[PDB]
Design a binder for these strands. Structure first.
Length: 88
RNA sequence: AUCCAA
């Protein structure tokens, strides 16, 4: 498969889906926040990316938020594409 | 409703 869908995922950058078209960063901060200090959040059309300041925090938020109720259905949580690959 | 950032 092409590298657009393959590569090493970050232990801190989480993928979250499915989402409604009305999810908010304030919702995910209450769900994922109790798992450690968060680095960044971004909500999008069908998903969001929740990053942690620690790998153990994100790894726990997967093992705890994966399969939780949101928009009347169980969502999923797993590792997402690695951040900070941008040039410098 | 399934990968965007940096």
């Amino acid at each position: 498969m092409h590298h657009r869908q393959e590569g090493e995922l970050s232990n801190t950058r989480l993928f979250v889906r499915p989402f409604p078209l009305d999810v908010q960063e304030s919702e995910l901060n209450e769900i994922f926040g109790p798992f450690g200090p968060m680095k960044e959040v971004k909500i999008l059309n069908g998903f969001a990316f929740v990053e942690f300041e620690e790998a153990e925090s994100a790894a726990k938020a997967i093992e705890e938020v994966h399969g939780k109720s949101f928009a009347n259905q169980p969502l999923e949580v797993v590792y997402s594409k690695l951040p900070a690959k941008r040039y410098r």
